């Protein structure tokens, strides 16, 4: 059914067509879904302008946020702020936290709620996800991590329990249960998209 | 436009209106998939095979399944075997990891291009069989992943905690384990075998 | 210097000459600690009370606990707690707690304090170690974990930055740093008697 | 009776009487070790070779060592190794994480038959190379192992919240530091690489 189109994202991620990020965008794109991107360098807009028809439509709303600036993500996001809406979720891609601050900064547009899912692909750990599920929680806001596997090695192949590794669009696919409603209940939690290999 | 409705799938152990299971069918009957059950006790059917108001028409295919032993476990998936005939997963709700790992290799048989199987529990190890079945069918391609439901009304201090230290401030109901199931069975749960999801408000990550 | 004899430890969980459990015992004897005992089986005292000169010199205090059974491990202590006196400290061995009723059990020797270490040796944590950390914190009581590598493997052997693995007896140290006072700072902590290899 | 006594150790950022790792070379001097400093700017000169009141009588052997650049950690270790010439392991204390690695490669030389190497904080992932040196060393068989000192005087709320919340009520110290690091390069720490030992109360398991 459920849980998908209007609704605004943020692929804060993308650096070319086989970013992760774009599996998350494309699947994104599918149901729906108003989208919103940012960028670290000048000219992977020069990629994304590109990156499209597919479907969301202007312009789209690339801002370039390089994401250890607290003054860049917050007209980063004020940028946005006021050119959008507020917005649905985010998506986020030594050691990191961007994540906590993207996401305090994230945490003023979505007032009625939403999501926010930040992708680890030793020895992150998954854990300001955690704390930072606690805060923006009573602000109806879920805070999870999706943690991939390899895409693209061959001992995974061989010893993950799938017998093969994942990609971007299936990668994309748990990004979009987890920005989608079908997760309502969920927070503070981390999926691994990894094969199985996480078991063993 | 998505993901894979029409499929078929067993739902094991739905006691009345609001067993957790219930919401497992209901989203499940609810996104088109084609339905299976069982019920221990079958004054479980005497509310199952009511209404059903569902979109199952047939039939249901209740099956009666004493979920420890063996043979009648042996016997369910085989009546199932010959009846609707062949599957897509399992949600397995209701130690008794034994119904488990014993469903789980039957359910084994149904299964020729692989799948999905879920299990739910309201400690963990469960997780630990969710992931060593999941390396023993993960060459047959059959996920396997626990979900754990935090409490509904089914306690009353540990009712209200909850209410105020989840993150989110309260709590799940059924139709919330229902609507994650629903991305167990699922392929947008495509890359995903023994793993554990909370549907817990947020109550995991703390204290 | 410091932190060793006189002072009371129940190694609960000798099964035999091979048990971790006699490495802590015999370092311990060394130490000049006063030891007590338990037991699973009629009979492993049968072989316990070969189990000695070493040192410790009676009875020794064995008692006989089964663990799980409530019932048994408080007259366990019950029976040890009018025998010895209240104790230093714990040693203790699906998938378990009994550490937390062990454990709850032995606060009430430990008035002015102690120390419990539990060892495990996928898919064990870890973790009322923690809980229970919290618990008697206040009560000035430390709750921590060793988790050991295996014993006498052979891919240990080669990615085991040792480049070997452990054993009872370094296990046995690792133990009464724990037991010790040098760790007086420390608690719902656990440390890999491991090689290494809990890195990698 | 016991352990390693004997042994010669490079202690390294003792800025006063309180700087933690002063209490490391304290405890340290305490168990008959011998010991060597090192001190960045040299008013902590101006204290060190005050007194030392240790028991450690040469020298002390300080040494200057300015913990960013790479020639004078490779000069440091190498005058060391002319000096006393050679060595037990090194507590490293006081991004930076270069002087671990650079010193921890150096350290190497002074070392033939292995050791241990102990570096403290005070953001994990110190825990992160505490790890992939650990690795890297382990076959020559010196072991890797971080340690984290929760606060002490050197935050005033944040000084207060420990007391009400670490399990163990209050904080640690300099010399409750000293007395662990003495465990690590230690042999009773022998089977041990690459971990983190919180010195912290019991504040590492919360909230």
Redesign the interface.
Same mark, same amino acid.
């Given at each position: 059914?459920?849980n998908l189109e209007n609704k605004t994202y943020v692929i804060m991620g993308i650096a070319n067509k086989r970013s992760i990020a774009f599996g998350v965008a494309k699947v994104l794109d599918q149901?729906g879904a108003k989208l919103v991107f940012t960028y670290r360098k000048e000219r992977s807009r020069k990629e994304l302008e590109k990156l499209l028809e597919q479907l969301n439509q202007p312009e789209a709303h690339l801002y370039q946020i390089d994401v250890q600036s607290d003054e860049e993500v917050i007209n980063g996001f004020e940028q946005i702020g006021k050119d959008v809406g507020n917005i649905d979720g985010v998506y986020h891609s @030594?050691?990191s936290y961007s994540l906590t601050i993207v996401a305090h900064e994230a945490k003023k547009l979505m007032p009625e709620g939403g999501s926010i899912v930040a992708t680890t692909y030793?020895?992150s750990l998954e854990a300001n996800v955690?704390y930072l599920? %606690?805060?923006l929680?009573?602000d109806?806001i879920?805070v999870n991590a999706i943690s991939a596997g390899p895409i693209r090695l061959k001992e995974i192949e061989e010893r993950?329990?799938?017998?093969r590794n +994942?990609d971007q669009v299936? +990668?994309g696919?748990?990004a979009?249960?987890l920005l989608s409603? %079908?997760?309502?209940?969920?927070?503070?939690?981390n @999926?691994? +998209?990894?094969?199985?290999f996480?078991?063993?």
């Amino acid at each position: 059914m459920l849980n998908l189109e209007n609704k605004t994202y943020v692929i804060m991620g993308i650096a070319n067509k086989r970013s992760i990020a774009f599996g998350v965008a494309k699947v994104l794109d599918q149901l729906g879904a108003k989208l919103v991107f940012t960028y670290r360098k000048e000219r992977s807009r020069k990629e994304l302008e590109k990156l499209l028809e597919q479907l969301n439509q202007p312009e789209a709303h690339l801002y370039q946020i390089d994401v250890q600036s607290d003054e860049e993500v917050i007209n980063g996001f004020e940028q946005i702020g006021k050119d959008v809406g507020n917005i649905d979720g985010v998506y986020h891609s @030594i050691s990191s936290y961007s994540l906590t601050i993207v996401a305090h900064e994230a945490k003023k547009l979505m007032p009625e709620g939403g999501s926010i899912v930040a992708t680890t692909y030793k020895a992150s750990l998954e854990a300001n996800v955690k704390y930072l599920a %606690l805060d923006l929680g009573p602000d109806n806001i879920r805070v999870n991590a999706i943690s991939a596997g390899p895409i693209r090695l061959k001992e995974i192949e061989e010893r993950a329990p799938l017998k093969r590794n +994942v990609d971007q669009v299936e +990668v994309g696919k748990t990004a979009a249960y987890l920005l989608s409603d %079908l997760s309502s209940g969920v927070t503070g939690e981390n @999926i691994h +998209v990894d094969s199985g290999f996480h078991a063993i």
